[PDB]
Amino acid sequence: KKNIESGVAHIHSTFNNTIVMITDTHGNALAWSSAGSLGFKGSKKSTPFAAQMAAEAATKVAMEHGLKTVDVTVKGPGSGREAAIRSLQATGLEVTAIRDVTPVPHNGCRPPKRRRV
Amino acid sequence: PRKGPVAKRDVLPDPIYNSKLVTRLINRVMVDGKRGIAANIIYNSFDIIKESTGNDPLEVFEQAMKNVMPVLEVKARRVGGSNYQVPVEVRPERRTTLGLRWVVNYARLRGEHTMEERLAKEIMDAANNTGASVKKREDTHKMADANRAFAHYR
Amino acid sequence: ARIAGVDIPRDKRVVVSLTYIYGIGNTTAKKVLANVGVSEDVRVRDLTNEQTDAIRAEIDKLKVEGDLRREVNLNIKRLMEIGSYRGIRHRRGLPTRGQNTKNNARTRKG
RNA sequence: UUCUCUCAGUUCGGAUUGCAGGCUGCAACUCGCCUGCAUGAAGCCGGAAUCGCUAGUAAUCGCGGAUCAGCACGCCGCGGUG
């Protein structure tokens, strides 16, 4: 439907999870996934393999509506950010841009206590 | 060891076919040091190969070896508390090691009434790209060339 | 029916199928088949009605029946009703020969 | 080296029980070793975890003797295949 054939992948990868949503060239979302929505639990949600299969479960649906063009904007200073890409290309999509979008404050707000573990 | 690499354990080529590969195949079938039984088994199996739709036992055996041996194996490693797996290349001696090992292991599990009726049949099925040995090779190649994802910078 | 007691199996030689009657082991089958002159020949029971009656009339001279279970049963019965140290053990599911019961009763007591 | 048996709880396995014997010893019930006939259990390769070993070694097969009337799956040695 809508035979968009263009869009941009958003990767949001923290220390203990990983989300990949694929939306079109502007806003409105088409298909998403995350490691939790694949039965994984707890620790394992941060290994790259989780990002592998989540990228797959998103692509497989995004190209069930016609899609080649995609870019990659990676938030999320975590680990599996590149495994997400390697699964994004090698199951059909047409990656052509990588960019980093990490919020960097110019010293505005105060962060929480340091943990004494 | 810790000091450094070690030797390679020279083998003695069997006198019948003058082929060190048949020697290692005899050594892998043998259990408990009963070697004459293993030799009788291998020779009956090759007799069965040539007699029934065969050309020569060395030729079809080499081709079966070629079709089974692997070329990309992975190694599951530990870093600092999280473990993964990465592919790597495969040096030559390990290749024939694995080949012989798989062939014997999966002929031992066939389900006929003689180790010869199993070995000859299994390496014939192997020289025609069939049998759980070839499927084991392909499982290995599929695990590799996929798990290169968390291996690309290892 | 078949040749003694009930139902000597098919498809096997006589020297082995004759084992299946309670009281005929392995050498007894040999001796019975030898006092007549019947061989195996080869891996089947394709006898004659003279060979079946031959090997049937001679088994009658032994205790291979529910006439043997009676003997064994009443033996243990006489044991447990006099004193008796062996019968006392027969009545507890405990080894009756001296067996140092640390594991050796899993057979004798399950 | 021949002849069998044919994938089965079985011509696998040999626990347990019945009857009859042998040997040592003044004497084998509690409490010995061995023989024969009969009976024929669990067990179809064993999770978490964990052990031995770098060559005539590991694995496997027998033989001898200390102790001792008798009594070894234990211990000390020896060699065969590898």
Q: Are residues C56 and C92 in the same domain?
A: no
Specify the DSSP element, H or E, that contains B75.
strand B73-78
Place of tokens 């790597």: B88
* d(C-alpha C43, C-alpha C88), whole Å: 47
Residue B129 falls within a domain, yes or no? yes
Side-chain-facing half-sphere of B18: CA atoms under 13 Å: 0
| Distance D7 C1' – B112 CA (angstroms) | 8
Q: Are residues C12 and C41 in the same domain?
A: yes
| Distance D45 C1' – C20 CA (angstroms) | 30
Q: Are residues C77 and C102 in the same domain?
A: yes
* d(C-alpha B42, C-alpha C24), whole Å: 43
Residue nearest to nucleotide D40 (CA to C1'): C25
Q: Are residues C51 and C81 in the same domain?
A: no
CATH number, position B89: 1.10.455.10
Which residues on adjacent β-strands are paired with residue A100?
Answer: A74
Nearest CA to B141 out of B106, B64, B89 is that of B89
Which value in Å is the resolution of this experimental model? 2.9
Which 3 state secondary structure label does DSSP give B87? strand
Interface touch A47/B152, C-beta < 8 Å = no
| Triad C94, C97, C98: Cα angle to 5° | 80
Q: Are residues C62 and C75 in the same domain?
A: no
Residue B62 falls within a domain, yes or no? yes
- Give the one of B82, B84, B149 whose C-beta lies nearest to A86's C-beta: B149
Nucleotides of D under 7 A from a protein CB: 1, 4-7, 11, 15-19, 29-32, 36-41, 54-55, 58-60, 80-82
* d(C-alpha C59, C-alpha B19), whole Å: 62
Question: Tokens for A34?
Answer: 């995350």
Q: Are residues C64 and C102 in the same domain?
A: no
Cβ proximity of A102 and A75 under 8 Å: yes
Specify the DSSP element, H or E, that contains B129.
none
Q: Domains in chain A: how many in total?
A: 1
Nearest CA to C6 out of C42, C58, C68, C56 is that of C56
Q: Are residues C49 and C82 in the same domain?
A: no
Residue B60 falls within a domain, yes or no? yes
* d(C-alpha B105, C-alpha B119), whole Å: 10
Method of elucidation: cryo-EM
How far out from the chain centre does Cα A38 lie? Answer: 14
* d(C-alpha A66, C-alpha A6), whole Å: 8
Which residues on adjacent β-strands are paired with residue A20?
Answer: A11, A33
Q: Which domain holds residue C28?
A: 1-70
Cβ proximity of A93 and A33 under 8 Å: no
Q: What's at A80, amino acid-wise?
A: G
Q: Which domain holds residue A102?
A: 1-117
Q: Which domain holds residue B85?
A: 20-143
- Report the chain B residue with the minimal C-alpha distance to residue A52: B149
Specify the DSSP element, H or E, that contains B83.
strand B83-88
Residue B152 with chain A: CB contacts under 8 Å: 82, 86
* d(C-alpha B123, C-alpha B103), whole Å: 7
Q: Are residues C51 and C84 in the same domain?
A: no
Residue B72 falls within a domain, yes or no? yes
Residue B8 falls within a domain, yes or no? no
Cβ proximity of B143 and B74 under 8 Å: yes
Question: Tokens for A26?
Answer: 């502007």
Residue B9 falls within a domain, yes or no? no
b/e code B40-79 from CB counts within 10 Å (16+ = b)? ebbbbbbebbeeeeeeebeebbeebbebbbbebbbeeeee
Q: How does DSSP assign C59-89, residue by residue? A: GGGS--STTHHHHHHHHHHHHTTTS-HHHHH
Nearest CA to C64 out of C3, C16, C12 is that of C3
Q: Does B84 touch chain A (CB under 8 A)?
A: yes
Q: Are residues C62 and C84 in the same domain?
A: no
Cβ neighbours of residue C63 closer than 8 Å, sequence gap 6 or more: C23, C71
How far out from the chain centre does Cα A8 lie? Answer: 10
Q: Domains in chain B: how many in total?
A: 1
* d(C-alpha B133, C-alpha A16), whole Å: 40
Q: Are residues C62 and C78 in the same domain?
A: no
Q: Are residues C62 and C89 in the same domain?
A: no
Straight-line distance from the first to the last Cα atom of chain B, in angstroms, rounded to the nearest whole number: 23
Which DSSP category does B64 fall into? H
Q: Are residues C63 and C92 in the same domain?
A: no
The CA distances from residue B27 to B11, B105, C102, in Å, are 10, 13, 44
